[PDB]
Design a protein around this ligand. Sequence first.
Ligand code: 80I
Ligand code: 80I
Lengths: 297, 299
Amino acid sequence: KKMAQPSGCVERCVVRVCYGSTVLNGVWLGDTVTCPRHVIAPSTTVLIDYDHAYSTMRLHNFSVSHNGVFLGVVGVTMHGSVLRIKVSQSNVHTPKHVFKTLKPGDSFNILACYEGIASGVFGVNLRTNFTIKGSFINGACGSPGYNVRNDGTVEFCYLHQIELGSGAHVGSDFTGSVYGNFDDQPSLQVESANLMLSDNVVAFLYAALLNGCRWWLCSTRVNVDGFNEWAMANGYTSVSSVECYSILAAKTGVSVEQLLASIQHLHEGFGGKNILGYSSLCDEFTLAEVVKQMYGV
Amino acid sequence: GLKKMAQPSGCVERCVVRVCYGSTVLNGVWLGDTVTCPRHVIAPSTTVLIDYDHAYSTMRLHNFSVSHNGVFLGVVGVTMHGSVLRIKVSQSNVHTPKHVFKTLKPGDSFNILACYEGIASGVFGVNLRTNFTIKGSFINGACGSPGYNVRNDGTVEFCYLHQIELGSGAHVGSDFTGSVYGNFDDQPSLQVESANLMLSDNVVAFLYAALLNGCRWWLCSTRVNVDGFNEWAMANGYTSVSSVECYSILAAKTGVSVEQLLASIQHLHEGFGGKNILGYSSLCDEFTLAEVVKQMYGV
Ligand SMILES: COc1cccc2[nH]c(C(=O)N[C@@H](CC(C)C)C(=O)N[C@@H](C[C@@H]3CCNC3=O)C(=O)COP(=O)(O)O)cc12
Ligand SMILES: COc1cccc2[nH]c(C(=O)N[C@@H](CC(C)C)C(=O)N[C@@H](C[C@@H]3CCNC3=O)C(=O)COP(=O)(O)O)cc12
């Protein structure tokens, strides 16, 4: 089961940012509100010149609010695709936090927001083309993505920015870099084709083994350099490392190399059969996710 | 694009507590000066059918331990109501949200806050199936994890407390009155659920989603009426369709009637024959109408 980590710590950090007639979400940490620079753009169909929109900017055009309650804007700086809006009071519900840049294969959580209010929470994976499969409509921009580490530290890593012509979603980190360097402009960009995250598929077959599902298991083995060479030719990523699968291979007796071979055979399809109710290989769950949901670690 | 989501969990996170009796531990929900929790926590360690009326009579308050975020609460009294206990504590939860208690019906969607030792670790949306079970993810210690919904007015509906995992892996809970959904027992025995029925109302919503995303290779021009479909749905593992007109918002945007979609379900019954609908290779009943219209239009 795909899960999101709980969002209360992040809910208190989501504000409403208004510039003229355009509204989106921002993230209030200390006395800074970070939001997509789309909010200062003019209503036009052309490509936006953001340097010019920044220069002709009026601080009194801003309206930043938390649950119907208005914060005073002190200043605004521009960093890549985001704005840093300094305000006259710090957020007293600021959680202990860091900023981290996601890597393809990472999982995290979206808190989907509209006019500064959370409406929904779900776990996503950052894909190898640096997009996610989320759900957003108009207004969602600035919805944050986060992870909660074991110590309680929240990692802020995503601010929603665009939905591509394909439907895949794209945002930036809090430095202002867009993931995959997509343009926060109204132009059709076509993302490159998604690879299966071989690490997640391996986690899922181990999950299959712990659930007593073994009809698919190959007796034979293929090693890492062999698998990765085959991966580059078949819409799959390289496998990370065998040692980091230790806790799942200990509990199962089945080495990673055995599942790599099983991925080559089952690549051709199942033949009407299931594997945990799925009819194709599952890209969806990482190893950490598999491990926390069967063992609580 | 349909993504199974949970409603925000923050207001529920402040009501979760650790409830301990002797050495046994589970979770509960603290509202006002009451903590509700499964009565299993006062069971004795004995592999036979628990005598809950006797274990209640031998119960001793000082054996209870109830804490929020490590901060312990004093128990003042305990009463048993079906399969849950109501524990009175000597201070009120200041973060008690406006709330009611609702019993779910088959087909209802709601949200689980998966909890262990009084700390939330995960949140997800679920649908109550026709066999009064849910497909969730829980390990030992999760008992008492709450199920909830948030109404448009901001009222949290508390509706579920996790009790048991059946041999098949499906999950059963109780509501806050103490009733177990499906009249399952909260005993370490072997009970077997009935076969699950595909939720026809959600398959209709799902097929509407597919049309609004431009996936319509499956679409039937044939119409079958509600009566005809309900009769067919019996013999093939689907529920009846409740109504038609609640989809009118979608019928208008696609030009397709509900009767075409029910003919399409009979036509799509076996499988898709290689093709897919929104990447799904068989019919999908995860999303309700309300989910589809909200995620796609914000209503
Ligand atoms: C020719 O043009 C295109 C061609 C092909 C693909 C394209 N894609 C985009 C795009 O995505 N454009 C951003 C605006 C840019 C300037 C950042 C946007 O629309 N973001 C939404 C979130 C979206 C709303 C629907 N689902 C979401 O995820 C906001 O939330 C904020 O914009 P608004 O709130 O509507 O003002 C334009 C475009
Ligand atoms: C032994 O005969 C059986 C035969 C076949 C299937 C069976 N299933 C159950 C059952 O489910 N038993 C309840 C206890 C009582 C109410 C009977 C239980 O195990 N609940 C777990 C959650 C469960 C645990 C794993 N996944 C979950 O969802 C907690 O909530 C924490 O319980 P503990 O921490 O271990 O005290 C007994 C049984």
